[PDB]
Amino acid sequence: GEAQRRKEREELAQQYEAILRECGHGRFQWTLYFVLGLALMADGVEVFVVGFVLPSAEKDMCLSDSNKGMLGLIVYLGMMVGAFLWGGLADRLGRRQCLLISLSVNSVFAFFSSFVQGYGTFLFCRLLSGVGIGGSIPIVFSYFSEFLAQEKRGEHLSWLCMFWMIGGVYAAAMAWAIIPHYGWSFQMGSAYQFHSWRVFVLVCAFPSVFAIGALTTQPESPRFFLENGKHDEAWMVLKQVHDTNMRAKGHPERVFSVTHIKTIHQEQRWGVRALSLGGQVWGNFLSCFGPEYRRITLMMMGVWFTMSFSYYGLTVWFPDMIRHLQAVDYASRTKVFPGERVEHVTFNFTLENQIHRGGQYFNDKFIGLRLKSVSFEDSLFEECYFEDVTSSNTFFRNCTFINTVFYNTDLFEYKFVNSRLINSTFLHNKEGCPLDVTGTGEGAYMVYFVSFLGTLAVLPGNIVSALLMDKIGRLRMLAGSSVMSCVSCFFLSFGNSESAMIALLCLFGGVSIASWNALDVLTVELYPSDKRTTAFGFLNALCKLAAVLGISIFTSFVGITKAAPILFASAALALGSSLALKLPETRGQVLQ
Amino acid sequence: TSILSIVYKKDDLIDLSRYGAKINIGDRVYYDSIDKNQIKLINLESSTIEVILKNAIVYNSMYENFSTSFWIKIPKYFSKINLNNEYTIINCIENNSGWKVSLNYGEIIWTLQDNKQNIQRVVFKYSQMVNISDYINRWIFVTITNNRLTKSKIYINGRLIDQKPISNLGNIHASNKIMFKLDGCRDPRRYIMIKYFNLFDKELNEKEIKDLYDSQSNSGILKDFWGNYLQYDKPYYMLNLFDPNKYVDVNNIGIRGYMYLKGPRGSVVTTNIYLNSTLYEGTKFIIKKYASGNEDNIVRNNDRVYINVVVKNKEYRLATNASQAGVEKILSALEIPDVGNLSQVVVMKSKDDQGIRNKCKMNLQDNNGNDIGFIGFHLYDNIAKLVASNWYNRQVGKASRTFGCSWEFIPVDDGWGESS
Ligand SMILES: *[C@@H]1O[C@H](CO[C@@H]2O[C@@H](C)[C@@H](O)[C@@H](O)[C@@H]2O)[C@@H](O[C@@H]2O[C@H](CO)[C@@H](O)[C@H](O)[C@H]2NC(C)=O)[C@H](O)[C@H]1NC(C)=O
Ligand SMILES: *[C@@H]1O[C@H](CO)[C@@H](O)[C@H](O)[C@H]1NC(C)=O
Ligand SMILES: *[C@@H]1O[C@H](CO)[C@@H](O)[C@H](O)[C@H]1NC(C)=O
């Protein structure tokens, strides 16, 4: 029974390899490569949008703490849901069908999030866009693998990973080109405002639409048809592959010699179909945890979890520590003025990063002044007058106000810390957020540059891994990149400036990419064609969950010590490499 | 039914009851110019009002019922000096037995003491951190009814607030002599205003208390925010009762221009003392006589007047064009000699058709005596524009609840102390 099923599966796997070797590698494979590359570039773009628009969205939507933290994790949660969902559905509906559905969902919700004015609605739309894009990598890799012969399968699959780098470069370039134009204030509705970061969100939603447009013109994988008992469709698709390949070669006269292909024998109503689909998907997921695949599944789970944890933790740790170093440098330059006596003067100014202490101001007019990180402490204002006062990161602590008037000022109730007001008057208060929202200026530029350097050191690793995956092997590439990543994690200690951390980020990003490439190719090659997308989507959902955990843990360690992140990343990567070294070798095997 | 009732007369304070209680007025007791019947007491020893009764009306019985009523105006408490500073304002205690009325920070207290030194207190507390208060620096009708068998009750504006059983006290021997003077206040700039002080020898029920409150309210005369008489040729800030968080403003001058309600209001704050809303915001509304036959400057009921809007220290005229689209007519501020035949006469209303006293209402009328409607506000594309509409008249005829047709006039007062 089961042995007969395994025998027929092996016979189909060998015949499919023979047919694919007959068809050859050429124009069809490269066209599908570029189509799925657009699908993967959308995935690469998706993970930068919220990180790039948080500084502007915080002021434009009054985002407090624990609201910018859940927005920075919502894409990963949506991705964790979507990867599992679409990977499970791909083995019952098809790779191309589920890819179309997921890409359309991502595009729709990314367009709709560009016009949402609230926060919770923006959070929901961004979560659903993450759900739509979560199924890109599993389906794309398991769809491209079923058109490749065994001769060069590691290299052809590894060349598919350049598109995440391309998407990251595209996102960084568009953020640099669009967001810095803060003057754009397009008005459609009195209560609604349309700034530049929404245009950035639209431009970042574009590649998913291009991916849908390109994918609509591709055929379903023949192996999916063969598994489900549809023989004529699979034969037609294989004939199309052969015809396109031969026409590209320059010999459009030979005939597809395959006549019959072995196929796997198959043994209100909307709710019935839904229940059947759920049952079949659960059966596939459970069979992934079967007696035949239980060791492979567990080692894959360990490798994916550990590598995702380390990579995402360090990748979010580098910019946070750069920001912390900049903040320390900024606080080291603060000016202190102890003791002042000002009287009878209209005295305006624009001071930044200052602390006035022990001041005494009597009948002073403060007309039109900009305050940035200016703090008044132990001061006394008597018969003063504040007009056209703009405030940012400005506080009044241990201050006393007597007969003072705040006319046309943004000095809200949260800027007076343990102060005492007597006979004070607040008139024509400016519109603003109820709480402090901070402000980012020129530094955003540098942030984009840093991103362009974090996704460009990846390119040498991608090239080397793509060229060498078949020559050394998947296992050795994975192990030799994980070990080097652990060594770089050890090297992390010798960095205390912004330039050093930019260099360290570039090094780590350029080192771990080969490991990620090798893991993708391995998890593609290690599963049968009737469970490939289910298992790969489950592992990618685990990757996203580990990403959330690692981001939280490594962000909690910023500014405390360098020992905890280094130890966590090195331990996780060492365990991942140890678990990876026990994996079976898949090089030089038919795509079983 | 009244034993003591202090009223004003020709340059003296008299008692309307048939007892002739002797009244002695100190050399620093003041009176208002327009409502000289109301009396003011300051924080000085010479600020004394003294009333002496007869021996036949002295409260010295066993089960004798009694009640008192008056109108009290107390300014805002500005600093922390006024906290925990209960000071007596009305005194009738001899040999540590009798009744007293005192004030504390946001409290009116009624105390009674027997010959056994028992204390029974009834307190009305009003908050001072409210945006717009009904009791801060505004006239309050306070009446206390004591039932020696069951309990003692406080009433403000005809409504019951607190009540406490007084069965424990056995005998009260109040003084033959009653004192009106601040006593025990450490603030040197503290004063009160009292008027219409009446005594009764029976516990008044809710019906009689409401009757007295309405009889003494002078419903035929309009009242401003503080509860005083409304006066011609006096600048008033405008407050809309249905929407009390925005103030009347203008943007342009002319028929094209309009007036609206701009918000939110500011705030006057003394930390942990008061967090009130600013009342001196907006444009002032002066009222000018048009056909008033009375010689005084007091605005009475059913008076046809002109309204001037003070914009940039310049006076204008409130008028509309009757012939326009919609039921509501948009209010506008025009030049006084450039009003032409635009509808500008306003009938000032203080009570309803049945005679029930309500707030101030303005009824815009044309030269033919036709009711354009009651002045209120209506929202045009998220802008609360001042209009005159007959919809309010329709609701009044149907005994419904109108929305936006009630107004308050806020002049500058010393008891509020807001900087303008
Ligand atoms: C707070 O102000 C009140 C009212 O004064 C008004 O507001 C001031 C800010 C200023 O603009 C004054 O010119 C205003 O008249 C003060 O109470 C009154 O103060 C004046 C002295 O300016 C005094 O003559 C009055 O008797 C005071 N009235 C009362 C009822 O006490 C108050 O003193 C101010 N607070 C403090 C702490 O001084
Ligand atoms: C404000 O300060 C500037 C100098 O920085 C001065 O030129 C200007 O006159 C000041 N404003 C007023 C109203 O005096
Ligand atoms: C500042 O110090 C304390 C509050 O921490 C306070 O007691 C002190 O009075 C303040 N200084 C002045 C000048 O008010």
XYZ file of N, CA, C and O in Angstrom, chain A residues 232-349:
472
model
N -3.668 16.172 -18.707
C -3.660 16.943 -19.945
C -3.083 18.337 -19.731
O -2.310 18.831 -20.560
N -3.447 18.988 -18.623
C -2.911 20.316 -18.342
C -1.402 20.272 -18.145
O -0.675 21.132 -18.657
N -0.911 19.278 -17.400
C 0.526 19.157 -17.184
C 1.258 18.898 -18.491
O 2.327 19.473 -18.739
N 0.702 18.031 -19.340
C 1.314 17.778 -20.638
C 1.356 19.046 -21.478
O 2.361 19.328 -22.140
N 0.276 19.830 -21.454
C 0.246 21.077 -22.209
C 1.302 22.054 -21.704
O 1.985 22.710 -22.499
N 1.449 22.167 -20.382
C 2.429 23.101 -19.832
C 3.847 22.664 -20.180
O 4.696 23.492 -20.535
N 4.133 21.362 -20.081
C 5.463 20.879 -20.441
C 5.743 21.088 -21.925
O 6.864 21.444 -22.312
N 4.732 20.876 -22.772
C 4.896 21.142 -24.196
C 5.176 22.615 -24.449
O 6.001 22.958 -25.302
N 4.492 23.503 -23.722
C 4.756 24.932 -23.862
C 6.183 25.271 -23.456
O 6.859 26.058 -24.130
N 6.656 24.689 -22.352
C 8.030 24.927 -21.915
C 9.008 24.495 -22.999
O 9.924 25.241 -23.372
N 8.814 23.285 -23.533
C 9.718 22.774 -24.559
C 9.680 23.636 -25.815
O 10.727 23.940 -26.401
N 8.482 24.039 -26.244
C 8.355 24.830 -27.462
C 9.028 26.184 -27.307
O 9.773 26.621 -28.191
N 8.786 26.863 -26.182
C 9.418 28.158 -25.955
C 10.933 28.018 -25.903
O 11.666 28.816 -26.500
N 11.419 26.982 -25.214
C 12.858 26.787 -25.088
C 13.499 26.551 -26.448
O 14.541 27.134 -26.767
N 12.876 25.706 -27.276
C 13.464 25.379 -28.571
C 13.375 26.550 -29.541
O 14.302 26.781 -30.326
N 12.271 27.304 -29.509
C 12.178 28.501 -30.338
C 13.240 29.519 -29.949
O 13.821 30.184 -30.814
N 13.506 29.659 -28.647
C 14.585 30.542 -28.215
C 15.945 30.022 -28.668
O 16.821 30.809 -29.043
N 16.143 28.701 -28.629
C 17.425 28.133 -29.040
C 17.713 28.415 -30.509
O 18.847 28.741 -30.875
N 16.703 28.290 -31.363
C 16.888 28.516 -32.782
C 16.546 27.299 -33.616
O 16.915 27.218 -34.791
N 15.842 26.343 -33.014
C 15.413 25.121 -33.692
C 13.926 24.904 -33.439
O 13.534 23.983 -32.713
N 13.058 25.743 -34.037
C 11.608 25.628 -33.827
C 10.942 24.598 -34.736
O 9.899 24.856 -35.339
N 11.551 23.417 -34.835
C 11.024 22.348 -35.674
C 10.940 20.993 -34.986
O 10.190 20.134 -35.465
N 11.670 20.767 -33.897
C 11.581 19.494 -33.200
C 10.260 19.391 -32.442
O 9.591 20.388 -32.160
N 9.889 18.157 -32.112
C 8.583 17.845 -31.546
C 8.767 17.295 -30.140
O 9.700 16.527 -29.880
N 7.880 17.699 -29.234
C 7.877 17.166 -27.877
C 7.582 15.671 -27.917
O 6.469 15.259 -28.260
N 8.578 14.862 -27.563
C 8.505 13.417 -27.736
C 7.721 12.708 -26.640
O 7.445 11.512 -26.778
N 7.353 13.400 -25.568
C 6.621 12.771 -24.474
C 5.148 12.692 -24.855
O 4.528 13.704 -25.197
N 4.585 11.487 -24.799
C 3.182 11.261 -25.125
C 2.310 11.031 -23.903
O 1.245 11.639 -23.790
N 2.732 10.168 -22.983
C 1.988 9.897 -21.763
C 2.893 10.110 -20.560
O 4.068 9.731 -20.579
N 2.339 10.718 -19.515
C 3.071 11.038 -18.298
C 2.392 10.330 -17.137
O 1.162 10.372 -17.014
N 3.189 9.671 -16.299
C 2.647 9.041 -15.104
C 2.002 10.090 -14.209
O 2.519 11.198 -14.049
N 0.855 9.742 -13.635
C 0.130 10.653 -12.764
C -0.241 9.931 -11.481
O -0.428 8.711 -11.475
N -0.339 10.690 -10.392
C -0.696 10.111 -9.103
C -2.195 9.843 -9.087
O -3.005 10.758 -9.273
N -2.567 8.584 -8.873
C -3.973 8.207 -8.895
C -4.716 8.878 -7.747
O -4.262 8.853 -6.599
N -5.862 9.475 -8.059
C -6.671 10.183 -7.077
C -7.861 9.319 -6.685
O -8.621 8.870 -7.549
N -8.017 9.090 -5.386
C -9.094 8.246 -4.886
C -10.343 9.070 -4.591
O -10.261 10.151 -4.009
N -23.762 27.157 1.497
C -24.005 25.740 1.741
C -22.867 24.893 1.185
O -22.025 24.400 1.936
N -22.850 24.723 -0.139
C -21.760 23.991 -0.772
C -20.436 24.731 -0.630
O -19.373 24.099 -0.593
N -20.478 26.062 -0.550
C -19.262 26.834 -0.314
C -18.637 26.461 1.024
O -17.415 26.302 1.132
N -19.467 26.311 2.057
C -18.961 25.840 3.335
C -18.395 24.436 3.250
O -17.418 24.108 3.927
N -19.000 23.588 2.415
C -18.487 22.233 2.228
C -17.091 22.274 1.619
O -16.176 21.574 2.071
N -16.906 23.103 0.588
C -15.584 23.239 -0.019
C -14.581 23.807 0.977
O -13.423 23.381 1.018
N -15.007 24.785 1.781
C -14.108 25.366 2.774
C -13.672 24.329 3.802
O -12.490 24.257 4.163
N -14.612 23.513 4.280
C -14.275 22.472 5.243
C -13.350 21.433 4.623
O -12.405 20.963 5.269
N -13.606 21.058 3.367
C -12.736 20.099 2.694
C -11.326 20.654 2.533
O -10.340 19.938 2.750
N -11.211 21.927 2.149
C -9.899 22.549 2.002
C -9.169 22.597 3.335
O -7.970 22.309 3.411
N -9.879 22.966 4.402
C -9.256 22.989 5.716
C -8.770 21.618 6.143
O -7.662 21.471 6.666
N -9.590 20.592 5.910
C -9.182 19.241 6.254
C -7.970 18.778 5.470
O -7.050 18.179 6.029
N -7.949 19.057 4.164
C -6.809 18.661 3.343
C -5.538 19.392 3.762
O -4.459 18.790 3.824
N -5.645 20.691 4.052
C -4.477 21.456 4.471
C -3.957 20.948 5.809
O -2.743 20.819 6.010
N -4.862 20.648 6.745
C -4.426 20.101 8.024
C -3.782 18.734 7.844
O -2.799 18.410 8.521
N -4.325 17.914 6.944
C -3.705 16.629 6.665
C -2.300 16.770 6.114
O -1.391 16.046 6.520
N -2.104 17.709 5.183
C -0.765 17.952 4.652
C 0.183 18.444 5.740
O 1.333 17.995 5.824
N -0.282 19.365 6.586
C 0.573 19.878 7.650
C 0.959 18.778 8.631
O 2.114 18.707 9.066
N 0.008 17.915 8.995
C 0.322 16.811 9.895
C 1.252 15.797 9.242
O 2.158 15.278 9.902
N 1.048 15.499 7.956
C 1.935 14.572 7.267
C 3.339 15.141 7.131
O 4.307 14.382 7.017
N 3.469 16.471 7.130
C 4.797 17.067 7.226
C 5.495 16.646 8.509
O 6.723 16.521 8.532
N 4.740 16.442 9.583
C 5.255 15.859 10.825
C 5.014 14.355 10.868
O 4.451 13.830 11.827
N 5.438 13.640 9.831
C 5.212 12.217 9.754
C 6.426 11.410 10.160
O 7.492 11.957 10.455
N 6.283 10.084 10.194
C 7.448 9.235 10.489
C 8.569 9.390 9.479
O 9.744 9.280 9.849
N 8.241 9.645 8.212
C 9.271 9.839 7.199
C 9.964 11.188 7.336
O 11.182 11.275 7.144
N 9.215 12.243 7.671
C 9.765 13.588 7.855
C 9.417 14.045 9.268
O 8.408 14.714 9.490
N 10.255 13.675 10.233
C 10.115 14.207 11.582
C 11.458 14.737 12.060
O 11.523 15.774 12.725
N 12.536 14.031 11.721
C 13.871 14.534 12.022
C 14.206 15.730 11.140
O 14.666 16.769 11.630
N 13.954 15.605 9.835
C 14.223 16.703 8.910
C 13.396 17.923 9.287
O 13.894 19.053 9.296
N 12.122 17.709 9.616
C 11.255 18.823 9.978
C 11.751 19.532 11.233
O 11.767 20.765 11.288
N 12.167 18.773 12.249
C 12.601 19.391 13.499
C 13.920 20.139 13.330
O 14.090 21.237 13.876
N 14.866 19.569 12.581
C 16.114 20.287 12.338
C 15.888 21.530 11.480
O 16.510 22.574 11.719
N 14.987 21.453 10.495
C 14.608 22.645 9.741
C 13.993 23.701 10.648
O 14.301 24.892 10.522
N 13.114 23.285 11.560
C 12.499 24.222 12.493
C 13.557 24.917 13.335
O 13.541 26.146 13.492
N 14.496 24.142 13.876
C 15.551 24.731 14.683
C 16.396 25.716 13.902
O 16.670 26.825 14.372
N 16.811 25.331 12.692
C 17.676 26.197 11.894
C 16.958 27.494 11.544
O 17.512 28.592 11.692
N 15.708 27.388 11.088
C 14.959 28.579 10.705
C 14.755 29.502 11.897
O 15.000 30.712 11.805
N 14.336 28.944 13.038
C 14.102 29.773 14.215
C 15.375 30.478 14.663
O 15.367 31.694 14.886
N 16.482 29.740 14.791
C 17.706 30.345 15.305
C 18.236 31.413 14.359
O 18.602 32.515 14.795
N 18.291 31.111 13.058
C 18.845 32.082 12.124
C 17.971 33.324 12.034
O 18.489 34.445 11.981
N 16.645 33.154 12.024
C 15.761 34.312 11.989
C 15.924 35.161 13.240
O 16.034 36.391 13.160
N 15.959 34.517 14.409
C 16.138 35.243 15.661
C 17.398 36.096 15.617
O 17.342 37.316 15.813
N 18.535 35.477 15.292
C 19.801 36.206 15.293
C 19.800 37.330 14.264
O 20.135 38.480 14.582
N 19.433 37.013 13.018
C 19.512 37.999 11.949
C 18.627 39.198 12.240
O 19.079 40.346 12.160
N 17.359 38.960 12.578
C 16.448 40.078 12.772
C 16.800 40.868 14.024
O 16.716 42.104 14.022
N 17.233 40.186 15.090
C 17.657 40.907 16.276
C 18.807 41.851 16.001
O 18.754 43.028 16.355
N 19.851 41.361 15.326
C 20.996 42.226 15.054
C 20.649 43.321 14.048
O 21.129 44.459 14.165
N 19.818 42.998 13.053
C 19.458 43.975 12.034
C 18.656 45.125 12.627
O 18.802 46.272 12.196
N 17.800 44.844 13.614
C 17.117 45.941 14.293
C 17.991 46.570 15.373
O 17.744 47.715 15.769
N 19.013 45.861 15.850
C 19.874 46.385 16.902
C 20.836 47.440 16.378
O 21.155 48.395 17.093
N 21.323 47.280 15.149
C 22.319 48.225 14.638
C 21.798 49.657 14.531
O 22.444 50.566 15.086
N 20.678 49.943 13.852
C 20.208 51.335 13.797
C 19.826 51.904 15.151
O 20.042 53.097 15.393
N 19.262 51.086 16.042
C 18.911 51.577 17.369
C 20.150 52.009 18.135
O 20.141 53.037 18.818
N 21.232 51.239 18.032
C 22.452 51.616 18.730
C 23.117 52.822 18.079
O 23.739 53.636 18.768
N 23.002 52.962 16.756
C 23.491 54.181 16.114
C 22.741 55.397 16.650
O 23.338 56.431 16.974
N 21.417 55.278 16.765
C 20.617 56.365 17.320
C 20.997 56.652 18.766
O 21.047 57.813 19.183
N 21.248 55.604 19.553
C 21.651 55.796 20.943
C 22.990 56.518 21.042
O 23.168 57.395 21.896
N 23.948 56.157 20.188
C 25.227 56.859 20.181
C 25.048 58.323 19.802
O 25.666 59.208 20.406
N 24.202 58.597 18.805
C 23.940 59.985 18.433
C 23.286 60.749 19.577
O 23.595 61.922 19.805
N 22.376 60.100 20.305
C 21.723 60.751 21.436
C 22.716 61.061 22.548
O 22.654 62.128 23.168
N 23.632 60.132 22.826
C 24.654 60.381 23.841
C 25.551 61.538 23.418
O 25.881 62.417 24.225
N 25.949 61.562 22.145
C 26.774 62.656 21.644
C 26.033 63.983 21.772
O 26.613 64.992 22.190
N 24.740 63.990 21.441
C 23.930 65.200 21.552
C 23.835 65.678 22.995
O 23.981 66.873 23.272
N 23.594 64.758 23.930
C 23.485 65.140 25.332
C 24.827 65.575 25.904
O 24.866 66.291 26.911
N 25.932 65.150 25.291
C 27.242 65.568 25.778
C 27.541 67.020 25.430
O 28.422 67.633 26.044
N 26.834 67.586 24.455
C 27.076 68.951 24.009
C 26.121 69.967 24.620
O 26.169 71.140 24.237
N 25.258 69.556 25.546
C 24.264 70.469 26.088
C 24.930 71.594 26.872
O 25.959 71.407 27.528
N 24.342 72.782 26.774
C 24.825 73.967 27.466
C 24.016 74.166 28.738
O 22.826 73.849 28.779
N 24.666 74.674 29.779
C 24.024 74.916 31.064
C 24.280 76.360 31.467
O 25.434 76.800 31.523
N 23.205 77.093 31.746
C 23.293 78.466 32.243
C 22.714 78.525 33.649
O 21.481 78.571 33.816
N 23.553 78.486 34.687
C 23.042 78.572 36.058
C 22.918 80.005 36.545
O 23.922 80.717 36.654
N 21.697 80.444 36.829
C 21.496 81.746 37.430
C 21.395 82.852 36.402
O 22.364 83.137 35.692
N 20.232 83.493 36.324
C 20.016 84.601 35.408
C 19.015 85.555 36.036
O 18.163 85.144 36.825
N 19.112 86.829 35.667
C 18.164 87.842 36.129
C 17.836 88.721 34.928
O 18.639 89.572 34.536
N 16.659 88.512 34.347
C 16.230 89.234 33.155
C 14.995 90.051 33.498
O 14.077 89.559 34.166
N 14.978 91.306 33.054
C 13.902 92.219 33.409
C 13.709 93.253 32.310
O 14.686 93.790 31.782
N 12.444 93.512 31.969
C 12.049 94.636 31.120
C 12.738 94.589 29.755
O 13.520 95.470 29.392
N 12.430 93.545 28.992
C 12.996 93.410 27.656
C 12.124 92.463 26.846
O 11.629 91.455 27.360
N 11.921 92.810 25.578
C 11.330 91.904 24.605
C 12.455 91.077 23.999
O 13.211 91.570 23.152
N 12.559 89.822 24.428
C 13.767 89.031 24.205
C 13.362 87.707 23.556
O 12.820 86.816 24.217
N 13.600 87.598 22.252
C 13.316 86.377 21.517
C 14.631 85.721 21.097
O 15.699 86.331 21.149
N 14.541 84.469 20.657
C 15.719 83.628 20.490
C 15.310 82.301 19.870
O 14.130 81.950 19.830
